[PDB]
Amino acid sequence: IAPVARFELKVEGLSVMSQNTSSDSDGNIVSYLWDFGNGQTSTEAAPTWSYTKAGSYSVTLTVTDDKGDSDTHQQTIKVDTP
Ligand SMILES: [Cl-]
Ligand SMILES: [Cl-]
Ligand code: NA
């Protein structure tokens, strides 16, 4: 129900850009934990990142709001080398 974690990704080769499309009907989102499925994380709203090895990676976003509630979304992506 609230908050709702959500994002969309744009993949270029091994590199990924994000758009944060999260929301909260009962408060305000104050923090983010992105988890790129490779051991890397970020606290940015809409980070850019990259991988080294071609493969399948799960990208997870957790959002947390002003009342201390969290929600998580995931997307698995393919990335390839040249
Ligand atoms: Cl990698
Ligand atoms: Cl994909
Ligand atoms: Na709100």
Side-chain angles (χ1 to χ4, degrees):
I1 26 208
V4 181
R6 195 177 60 170
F7 59 79
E8 301 187 8
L9 302 181
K10 187 194 77 71
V11 175
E12 292 207 333
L14 292 170
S15 189
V16 190
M17 302 180 62
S18 65
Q19 183 193 213
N20 198 318
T21 66
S22 301
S23 63
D24 195 343
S25 61
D26 188 35
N28 298 285
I29 295 167
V30 303
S31 69
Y32 306 95
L33 190 285
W34 288 87
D35 164 354
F36 305 138
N38 68 338
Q40 296 177 327
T41 65
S42 179
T43 67
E44 303 179 11
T48 306
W49 65 102
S50 61
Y51 302 95
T52 295
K53 196 178 192 177
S56 185
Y57 299 90
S58 297
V59 178
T60 305
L61 172 63
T62 294
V63 305
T64 304
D65 78 1
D66 63 297
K67 47 178 178 38
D69 298 327
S70 298
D71 188 57
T72 304
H73 180 61
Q74 192 188 263
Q75 182 180 152
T76 297
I77 54 172
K78 290 202 202 36
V79 302
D80 202 3
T81 45

